[PDB]
């Protein structure tokens, strides 16, 4: 396992788990300096932003992670569900259903 990326993920999850979504986001942006193309980093980053209520932001991060998630179906399913939840919180139930449709058949 790649230690540096995993260290930042681990640190991010400890911070999110503690209620410090700001630092978690900072830790995940530091993770990108090591792994700018890691969809799992983007997945967690989109989660933290979504948990902060920054839905439109989360959606674009998750949509970016998706472009790097090719041939990783469990992860693409996860990212689409995140995108659905981000559309929902933006008042968009059509784009949310269409996203959950892509999560179910990827």
Numbering used by the authors: 154 to 259
The paper states:
In the major clinical pathogen Pseudomonas aeruginosa, PBP1B is anchored within the cytoplasmic membrane but regulated by a bespoke outer membrane-localized lipoprotein known as LpoP. Here, we report the structure of LpoP, showing an extended N-terminal, flexible tether followed by a well-ordered C-terminal tandem-tetratricopeptide repeat domain. We show that LpoP stimulates both PBP1B transpeptidase and glycosyltransferase activities in vitro and interacts directly via its C terminus globular domain with the central UB2H domain of PBP1B. LpoP is a predicted lipoprotein of 259 amino acids with a clear lipobox signal sequence that promotes localization and attachment to the P. aeruginosa outer membrane via an N-terminal lipid modification at Cys19 (Greene et al., 2018).
Crystals of P. aeruginosa LpoP143-259 displayed monoclinic P21 symmetry with unit cell dimensions of a = 48.8 Å, b = 154.6 Å, c = 54.1 Å, and β = 90.1°, and diffracted with a resolution of 2.2 Å. There are eight molecules of LpoP in the asymmetric unit. The resulting maps showed well-resolved electron density for most of the protein chain, allowing near complete tracing of the ordered part from residues 152 onward (see the STAR Methods). The structure indicated a monomeric form of the protein with no obvious crystallographic formation of larger oligomers. LpoP143-259 is made up of six α helices (H1–H6) of variable length that form helix-turn-helix motifs similar to those of TPRs and that are linked together through short loops (Cortajarena et al., 2004, Zeytuni and Zarivach, 2012). Numerous inter-helical hydrophobic contacts favored by the high percentage of Leu (12%) and Ala (22%) stabilize the core structure. LpoP has a striking structural similarity to protein domains formed by repetition of TPR domains (prosite PS50293 family). LpoP's C-terminal globular domain exclusively consists of three repeated TPR motifs, giving it primarily alpha-helical character and a structure greatly similar to the N-terminal domain of CpoB. The maximal chemical shift perturbations were mapped on the LpoP structure and found to concentrate mainly in the region connecting the extremities of helix 2 and helix 3. This region also contains the most conserved amino acid residues as obtained by alignment of 150 sequences using ConSurf software.
